[PDB]
Amino acid sequence: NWSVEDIVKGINSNNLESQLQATQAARKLLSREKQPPIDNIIRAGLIPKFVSFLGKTDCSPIQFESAWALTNIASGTSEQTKAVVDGGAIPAFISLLASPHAHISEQAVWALGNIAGDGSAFRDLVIKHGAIDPLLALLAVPDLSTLACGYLRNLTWTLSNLCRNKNPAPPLDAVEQILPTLVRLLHHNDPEVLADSCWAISYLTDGPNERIEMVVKKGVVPQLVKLLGATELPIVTPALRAIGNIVTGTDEQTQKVIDAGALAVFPSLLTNPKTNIQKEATWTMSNITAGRQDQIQQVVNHGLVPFLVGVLSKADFKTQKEAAWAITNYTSGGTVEQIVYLVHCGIIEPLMNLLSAKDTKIIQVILDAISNIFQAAEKLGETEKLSIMIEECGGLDKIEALQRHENESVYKASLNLIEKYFS
Amino acid sequence: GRKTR
Amino acid sequence: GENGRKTR
Known part of the structure; x- marks a missing residue:
């Protein structure tokens, strides 16, 4: 386990193999459970050198180690994520999405997910650098089951962060471009892919009726109702949130939820041992009882x-x-x-x-x-x-x-x- | 009316 | 998960 001083010495050596070993040592420091020295590595001025290593196409090991090291820095505070962005990492990571090495491309997806997850500004900046097209191209296969499980989960989570953080909501055309892939993931047979896809749908429906209509027009309400009855709490929670957001819209949008059979799940939802499930299910009911008299009658029936x-x-x-x-x-x-x-x-x-x-x-x-x-x-x-x-x-x-x-x-x-x- | 939250 | 960032 190296000191930060030794890592700086190795990276400043202008010896590519010495820089690779120093970067790997930095990656291991930043991978500790107990207090990764993120701030110490930032103050040592190592981020610009890590970003430069992302472009060394001839040394893919040093691409992977710096990407991993930068990913752990970007996972920290907003100021630590800002340091990664300020180092020019966004366009560099987007270039890495086309890497022939899956572990390097996956690391780039992870890093862009941490950056976009900071807030709406970095989310929109990631979109402005053109990340959506290469991210979507990684999922352009006829059957998602042929992709690696961890690779698919990371892409779902990153795309989900591109859907988060209102004020402002994500750009309309960005959501437009993202949504058909998101619906594919909402039908995949993996519980973690299902959870993060449901969270993204819940982000997209947390908006005005025009935003809810984009999601409802894609036909996801029946699948949301199906996932509403899953045994996994990490799936029910985002699915119920997405359902609860949709019933804040028009009466016609609320009717699509009722037509899909959502009301038949609420006996167990309204008695769910998880306190937050009961609260959100009851909040959903309050927005259905605010509907038409024929919709109140459905609640009665x-x-x-x-x-x-x-x-x-x-x-x-x-x-x-x-x-x-x-x-x-x-x-x-x-x-x-x-x-x-x-x-x-x-x-x-x-x-x-x-x-x-x-x-x-x-x-x-x-x-x-x-x-x-x-x-x-x-x-x-x-x-x-x-x-x-x-x-x-x-x-x-x-x-x-x-x-x-x-x-x-x-x-x-x-x-x-x-x-x-x-x- | 609708409570958005 | 609904967390903004993941460390690896």
Whole structure:
């Protein structure tokens, strides 16, 4: 294990074999588990020499060692990744994508993935240097199963970083050029390829409806719903995120998710032991209950209302907040018959129990839902029968307390129902 | 309406 | 994985 001083001496020797052995020693230092001396190698001015070695086509070993050494530097902080970019490594790594040695080409893919992963600026700069075409050419085979497993996983991960980081979102034509290959990877039989492809789709759908439409037009929703029921949590999490992003779009885009059969997976999703899966599944439900009345009816027909009642009754608090949003959206756009069905499933008591949470937003959300249920009660004439339900389960002496609350929205949204339905 | 997050 | 960078 060399010192940084000895590595500098070997690289400054102008002896190609001495530089190769010094670069390999640098690669081994940067491959330690415990505190790789990335900053020490940067301060020694070694990055420009590593980048120069990337072009030594006659010495492919020294290309590989510097690429690996630069890859570990670019995996560090934003300032350490900037040092790799400032050394001119982006066009050099893009030239390495055409290397006849798979391990060298793969190392270049890895490095560009670390660089693009820093943020939208380096992502777009990697795209401006023209990385997409050679990256895609590496996947231009009729069957992905003929490619090496690790090689395929690294390409999927790097392409996935080219899809990440809004503000700004990736360029439209870049996503356009990337998307057919990404759909191929979304159908590959490897669990890691599937996870990273799902994450990329989730990045691309985390945008305005026009971005969601590009992805939905490629027909990936049925495959996303299929991966939604996988046994691997690393696959379900990005798939559910992508599904949740799509249902934030138009009602027609939400309908494609429903048509693909997504609602049949939610009984297990809404009872998933992983807290974040329950929260994201409930958030997805809140954006489906904000849809049309025929889409709310699909939620009813799949028996999902009792599961919303359960999540509202017992879940992590952030999941219960998403459930309160789901009920408020349900009662805001639902029919009277649908709202009556919600009350018959026992929504009132867990709704009243959450009026004790010190979070001010969920109180406003719950008071909104109670108002919408009372509007359905006025149309039927049972405005008083509902008032007794809220009184019997202790909800009446929780609304009276919200009258003496500091926030001015709950201020009025508590006296209103006292004056109309109880006084 | 839709909560984007 | 959903990590920005991987070290090798």
